[PDB]
Amino acid sequence: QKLIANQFNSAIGKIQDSLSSTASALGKLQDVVNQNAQALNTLVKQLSSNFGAISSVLNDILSRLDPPEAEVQIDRLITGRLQSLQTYVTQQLIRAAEIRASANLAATKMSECVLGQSKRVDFCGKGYHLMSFPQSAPHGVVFLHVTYVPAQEKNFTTAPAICHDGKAHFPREGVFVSNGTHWFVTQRNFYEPQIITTDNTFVSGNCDVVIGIVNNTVYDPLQPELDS
Amino acid sequence: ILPVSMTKTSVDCTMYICGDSTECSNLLLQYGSFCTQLNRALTGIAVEQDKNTQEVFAQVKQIYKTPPIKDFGGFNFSQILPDPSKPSKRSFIEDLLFNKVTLICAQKFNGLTVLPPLLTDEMIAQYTSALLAGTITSGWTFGAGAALQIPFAMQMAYRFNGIGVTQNVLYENQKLIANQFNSAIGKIQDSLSSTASALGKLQDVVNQNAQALNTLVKQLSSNFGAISSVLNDILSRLDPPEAEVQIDRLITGRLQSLQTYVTQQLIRAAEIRASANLAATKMSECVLGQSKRVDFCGKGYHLMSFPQSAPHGVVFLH
Amino acid sequence: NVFQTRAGCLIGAEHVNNSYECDIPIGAGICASYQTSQSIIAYTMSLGAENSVAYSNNSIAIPTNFTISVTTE
Numbered sequence A: 001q002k003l004i005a006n007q008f009n010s011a012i013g014k015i016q017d018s019l020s021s022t023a024s025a026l027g028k029l030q031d032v033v034n035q036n037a038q039a040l041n042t043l044v045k046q047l048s049s050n051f052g053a054i055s056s057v058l059n060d061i062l063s064r065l066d067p068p069e070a071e072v073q074i075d076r077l078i079t080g081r082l083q084s085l086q087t088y089v090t091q092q093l094i095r096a097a098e099i100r101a102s103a104n105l106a107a108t109k110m111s112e113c114v115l116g117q118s119k120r121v122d123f124c125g126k127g128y129h130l131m132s133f134p135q136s137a138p139h140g141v142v143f144l145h146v147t148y149v150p151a152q153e154k155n156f157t158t159a160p161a162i163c164h165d166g167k168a169h170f171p172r173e174g175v176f177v178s179n180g181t182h183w184f185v186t187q188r189n190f191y192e193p194q195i196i197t198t199d200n201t202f203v204s205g206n207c208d209v210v211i212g213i214v215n216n217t218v219y220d221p222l223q224p225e226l227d228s
Numbered sequence B: 001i002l003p004v005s006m007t008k009t010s011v012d013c014t015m016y017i018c019g020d021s022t023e024c025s026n027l028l029l030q031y032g033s034f035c036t037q038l039n040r041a042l043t044g045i046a047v048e049q050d051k052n053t054q055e056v057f058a059q060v061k062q063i064y065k066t067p068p069i070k071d072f073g074g075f076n077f078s079q080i081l082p083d084p085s086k087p088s089k090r091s092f093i094e095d096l097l098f099n100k101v102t103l104i105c106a107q108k109f110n111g112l113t114v115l116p117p118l119l120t121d122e123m124i125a126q127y128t129s130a131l132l133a134g135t136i137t138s139g140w141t142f143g144a145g146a147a148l149q150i151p152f153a154m155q156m157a158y159r160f161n162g163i164g165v166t167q168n169v170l171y172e173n174q175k176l177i178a179n180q181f182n183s184a185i186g187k188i189q190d191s192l193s194s195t196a197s198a199l200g201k202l203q204d205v206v207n208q209n210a211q212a213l214n215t216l217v218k219q220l221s222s223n224f225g226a227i228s229s230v231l232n233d234i235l236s237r238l239d240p241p242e243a244e245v246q247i248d249r250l251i252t253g254r255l256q257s258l259q260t261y262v263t264q265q266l267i268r269a270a271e272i273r274a275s276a277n278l279a280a281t282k283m284s285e286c287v288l289g290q291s292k293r294v295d296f297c298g299k300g301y302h303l304m305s306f307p308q309s310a311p312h313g314v315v316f317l318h
Numbered sequence C: 001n002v003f004q005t006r007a008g009c010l011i012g013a014e015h016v017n018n019s020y021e022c023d024i025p026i027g028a029g030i031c032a033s034y035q036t037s038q039s040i041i042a043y044t045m046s047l048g049a050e051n052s053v054a055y056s057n058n059s060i061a062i063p064t065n066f067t068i069s070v071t072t073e
């Protein structure tokens, strides 16, 4: 426990730094905020454009011309601007449905990842997944996926079974392994060898069909008790 | 078979609209931002189109590769594992694909250029050689960390428990399964060889794009109520205050006809972006893991999967 | 000092036989980058950084120790 706490406490820390020293983490959020504003200015600037009208001020045409003139012009402005809304609208509808599709991806992580523990690999961030902490951020949300990534490997020599008496044994959970002398049955993600006794292993049929079985003796828990 | 990217085009607004006429291009100055906000759009697509392919395939840290010698306990991947004697090593099956799918400069004649993808069909096929060589040796764990060799048939012993069959099944049946699997692979070649209707999806995307270009092009030849659909003719025959009124309609017309073409992409392009993520998922959960989500990874309980790229696409063998 | 590419005509960068991770991806696998004096180099990108796992049909490798990352999304 102690260790993990530190690893986790430490791990938190770096985030501050990852965030403090970098503007390029939040690009996504940072972007959305642009594209909107980006798309407004465009929408606005369109006000200043002639669209082939004599001028992009409405009241000028009004001022200078007699309306049956302005009628024809102010079309183009209207025709022009009116169009230029639909462009702006549509762009939103599309964009806005690119968010709606990224809400649900949050509304999911928030549900599965936070509220649960997610089994879906690399949904909740590289590694097996432990928990998560949301943090809002402006027009956004930010998860901190605390995940568990294994580290230091040791080769071993595995064998899928064991002939004990000619019965097989297969591990009940996680591989057999040996370091080359004694065979050990371990759990699969964290080397923690254990002597092999019938409680680690269940028996299926006789040996031979197995491909790669190896010899060994599977100690009996009971026998020492029956030893007396 | 999922689409993944789509052909990234990009389009000059100007010369598409105005061939070689400042007089035109001058008019085009009026509408202003249009010409430059298309390119903003069509880039926004064309940028991500290489983000899709980034996410789908490049989930893998380190390009792996199989051992020299194939001892898999009897499963036989030679079909899928890269074909060393190919120049570009696209393992056999992948090549059926590149044939089963299908001018390039024909569309790029009116400013409608087609920028090449960030990744190249040669690279794509290195990744899916990794993914597929880590899947084989390393189990799934290479998605969760340092790849860990584990002997295959001591993997398919796990990818069983995942479906709730005790493993003593596997070892006791190993031979059989290998055959079932080896055989099963085979049919795919045939399913693919004898049929053009497997790849419809991929095959379609490639159409609708090209389909939508030609339309875009043909629009050049249309009058939109102009006296003629050649820009320079109006220019030639008329004195500009005449052409002014015409060349509107052309510009007005074509300019519109871009937005139609643009928008169609934006929508379509977001129908891919939503099918990338569906790949970027299967690739993650299905390949790199073992999926519990029923019928996500194909009818039946699910054992593993092998991606195979295909042009603008990807193909899983679940 | 011109390097014709699969992408197009690249002017002002120095082809490099070496291959490093991608930096300013250009096209067709050509990723420019700034470093070495220094100038912009344009070099075919390295998909990843190679590895090969020693597979062998009896050889398993079991992590002994772990980490806890924290990432962000």
Ligand SMILES: *[C@@H]1O[C@H](CO)[C@@H](O[C@@H]2O[C@H](CO)[C@@H](O)[C@H](O)[C@H]2NC(C)=O)[C@H](O)[C@H]1NC(C)=O
Residues within 6 Å of the ligand: A179, A180, A181, A182
């Ligand atoms: C493999 O691991 C086993 C378990 O520790 C080792 O067997 C033990 O080795 C230590 C070495 O100091 C002895 O003190 C124990 O008495 C051994 N146990 C038994 C039951 O004999 C074995 O030596 C290890 N092999 C290698 C190569 O490290």
Ligand SMILES: *[C@@H]1O[C@H](CO)[C@@H](O[C@@H]2O[C@H](CO)[C@@H](O)[C@H](O)[C@H]2NC(C)=O)[C@H](O)[C@H]1NC(C)=O
Residues within 6 Å of the ligand: A163, A213, A214, A215
């Ligand atoms: C595991 O040990 C057994 C012995 O307990 C070995 O069985 C021997 O196998 C050889 C050839 O298959 C026979 O000639 C012997 O008569 C067998 N002995 C017994 C007691 O049955 C078996 O070969 C060993 N496994 C491996 C992989 O070496």
Ligand SMILES: *[C@@H]1O[C@H](CO)[C@@H](O[C@@H]2O[C@H](CO)[C@@H](O)[C@H](O)[C@H]2NC(C)=O)[C@H](O)[C@H]1NC(C)=O
Residues within 6 Å of the ligand: B070, B075, B076, B077, B078, B079
């Ligand atoms: C794996 O399968 C492939 C194809 O199913 C085998 O390739 C054939 O192998 C035979 C040998 O029995 C050769 O005569 C043929 O030329 C091969 N066909 C092709 C199309 O290359 C391969 O031998 C199998 N290998 C293993 C180890 O299973």
Ligand SMILES: *[C@@H]1O[C@H](CO)[C@@H](O[C@@H]2O[C@H](CO)[C@@H](O)[C@H](O)[C@H]2NC(C)=O)[C@H](O)[C@H]1NC(C)=O
Residues within 6 Å of the ligand: A003, A006, A007, A151, C065, C066, C067
């Ligand atoms: C597991 O790995 C961690 C680091 O990932 C090791 O933690 C360090 O252990 C050394 C010596 O045990 C200490 O000097 C450090 O203070 C530890 N670091 C931290 C952050 O606590 C840990 O020892 C490893 N455990 C095993 C069994 O190898």
Ligand SMILES: *[C@@H]1O[C@H](CO)[C@@H](O)[C@H](O)[C@H]1NC(C)=O
Residues within 6 Å of the ligand: A153, A154, A155, C054
């Ligand atoms: C296990 O053996 C392989 C064989 O090359 C080697 O690459 C790997 O580093 C070994 N593992 C350790 C921890 O030494």
Ligand SMILES: *[C@@H]1O[C@H](CO)[C@@H](O)[C@H](O)[C@H]1NC(C)=O
Residues within 6 Å of the ligand: A211, A212, A213, B071, C057, C058
């Ligand atoms: C493993 O492969 C080796 C190749 O050196 C072979 O001799 C041995 O029989 C195989 N054993 C198993 C269990 O796969």
Ligand SMILES: *[C@@H]1O[C@H](CO)[C@@H](O)[C@H](O)[C@H]1NC(C)=O
Residues within 6 Å of the ligand: C015, C016, C017
């Ligand atoms: C690149 O390297 C090859 C061999 O690695 C060598 O033959 C060639 O001359 C080099 N050319 C350049 C431009 O670096």
